[PDB]
């Protein structure tokens, strides 16, 4: 945790923050603490003013491409830093430290998030994708507003701060059942059944940690299972202003075997998705910007129970899809595929 600022135009207002990742582990949130550093004289008969806001975007980004643009704030909140108001409650430790360090014009503020929101997420589309570019941001902003007898609500930019901020996804104390899928087949001209069970070690994964994908063929039929290949599917819908979709391998390995006509087999197969792992990253749901090196694949979405689901904006899933070629028989033209999906989490660890 490094303590980082941002000084406004004018030299009146500084932001000061401990860290830029703020962690949601689902039994609660952590929130934004942090002091302002006001110059005296030019805050003067001036209010100061610190909001965090959590929004929604949807539009093309570059300001040289016509295209309409939409935004909704799912959360919104502000606090008055000075002149103070008495009614600020504890400082923390962090706080404590810059007051100390910055003297008498620092003022804290804590702004908490409640427990309807997103994680940070953000997409821009691929070539073949429809939808625009959307995502979850998170802003806090100190700024100082004055009224003349001429003008009111003033706010100049000079005399703003806007630094911005990830709200990230860790993982809860509990977790699901153990992912678990059966499906089987009977082809056309033949009774006689493929059987398809998958099974994975656990429901929530962590960014990097492999995922063993355990399969087992139970192949009765006179077709030959000529290839065995699993994959990881992230899986977004955008659920405010567009509905749009998209389907994405982020990780992909293929089993050596084949399994003959009436035979089995069980194997299993490792996959680890990663950003990292395709040099395309349009079309596919992140924690950030493209370019940045702190950058991940989003983590999935969890939904307070009760919620309107629109409120996400973005929804992030992960599947393991497990594939089986089937060959032709004698008079086919082509050989076949058959499928199925299993659910998982992805996010980060427990918090320590
Ligand atoms: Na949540």
């Given at each position: 945790?490094?303590?980082?600022?941002?000084?406004?135009?004018?030299?009146?207002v500084?932001?000061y923050?401990?860290?830029?990742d703020?962690i949601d582990?689902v039994?609660?949130?952590?929130?934004?603490?942090?002091?302002?550093?006001?110059?005296?004289?030019?805050?003067?008969?001036?209010?100061?003013?610190?909001?965090?806001?959590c929004?929604?975007?949807?539009?093309?980004?570059?300001?040289?491409?016509?295209?309409?643009?939409?935004?909704?704030?799912?959360?919104?909140?502000?606090?008055?830093?000075?002149?103070?108001?008495?009614?600020?409650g504890?400082?923390?430790?962090?706080?404590?430290?810059?007051?100390?360090?910055?003297?008498?014009?620092?003022y804290?503020?804590?702004?908490?998030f409640?427990?309807?929101?997103?994680?940070?997420?953000?997409?821009?589309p691929?070539?073949?994708?429809?939808?625009?570019?959307?995502?979850?941001?998170?802003?806090?902003?100190?700024?100082?507003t004055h009224?003349?007898?001429?003008?009111?609500?003033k706010?100049?930019?000079?005399s703003?701060?806007?630094?911005?901020?990830?709200?990230?996804?860790?993982?809860?104390?509990?977790m699901?059942?153990?992912?678990?899928?059966?499906?089987?087949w009977?082809?056309?001209?033949?009774?006689?059944?493929?059987?398809?069970?998958?099974?994975?070690?656990?429901?929530?994964?962590?960014?990097?940690?492999?995922i063993?994908?355990?399969v087992?063929?139970?192949?009765?039929?006179?077709?030959?299972?000529?290839k065995?290949?699993?994959?990881?599917?992230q899986?977004?819908?955008?659920?405010?202003?567009?509905?749009?979709?998209?389907?994405?391998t982020?990780?992909?390995?293929?089993?050596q075997?084949?399994v003959?006509?009436?035979?089995?087999?069980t194997?299993?197969?490792?996959?680890?998705?990663?950003?990292?792992?395709?040099?395309?990253?349009?079309?596919?749901?992140?924690?950030?910007?493209?370019?940045?090196?702190?950058?991940?694949?989003?983590?999935?979405?969890?939904?307070?129970?009760?919620i309107?689901?629109?409120?996400?904006?973005?929804?992030?899933?992960?599947?393991?899809?497990?594939?089986?070629?089937?060959?032709?028989?004698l008079?086919?033209?082509?050989?076949?595929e058959?499928?199925?999906?299993?659910p998982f989490?992805?996010?980060?660890?427990?918090?320590?």
């Amino acid at each position: 945790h490094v303590i980082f600022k941002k000084i406004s135009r004018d030299k009146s207002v500084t932001i000061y923050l401990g860290k830029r990742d703020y962690i949601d582990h689902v039994e609660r949130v952590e929130p934004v603490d942090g002091v302002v550093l006001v110059d005296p004289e030019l805050v003067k008969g001036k209010r100061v003013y610190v909001s965090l806001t959590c929004a929604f975007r949807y539009g093309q980004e570059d300001i040289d491409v016509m295209g309409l643009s939409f935004r909704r704030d799912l959360y919104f909140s502000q606090v008055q830093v000075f002149p103070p108001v008495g009614a600020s409650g504890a400082t923390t430790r962090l706080q404590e430290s810059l007051i100390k360090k910055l003297g008498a014009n620092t003022y804290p503020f804590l702004l908490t998030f409640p427990d309807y929101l997103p994680c940070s997420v953000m997409l821009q589309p691929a070539p073949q994708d429809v939808g625009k570019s959307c995502g979850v941001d998170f802003e806090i902003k100190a700024f100082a507003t004055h009224s003349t007898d001429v003008e009111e609500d003033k706010i100049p930019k000079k005399s703003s701060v806007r630094l911005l901020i990830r709200k990230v996804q860790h993982a809860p104390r509990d977790m699901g059942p153990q992912p678990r899928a059966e499906a089987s087949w009977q082809f056309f001209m033949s009774d006689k059944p493929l059987r398809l069970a998958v099974s994975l070690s656990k429901e929530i994964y962590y960014h990097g940690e492999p995922i063993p994908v355990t399969v087992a063929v139970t192949n009765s039929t006179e077709k030959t299972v000529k290839k065995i290949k699993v994959l990881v599917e992230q899986v977004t819908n955008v659920v405010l202003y567009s509905s749009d979709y998209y389907i994405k391998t982020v990780a992909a390995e293929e089993a050596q075997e084949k399994v003959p006509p009436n035979s089995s087999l069980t194997k299993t197969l490792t996959l680890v998705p990663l950003l990292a792992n395709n040099r395309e990253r349009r079309g596919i749901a992140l924690d950030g910007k493209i370019k940045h090196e702190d950058t991940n694949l989003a983590s999935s979405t969890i939904i307070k129970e009760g919620i309107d689901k629109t409120v996400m904006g973005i929804l992030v899933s992960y599947q393991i899809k497990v594939k089986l070629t089937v060959s032709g028989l004698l008079g086919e033209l082509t050989s076949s595929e058959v499928a199925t999906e299993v659910p998982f989490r992805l996010m980060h660890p427990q918090p320590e």
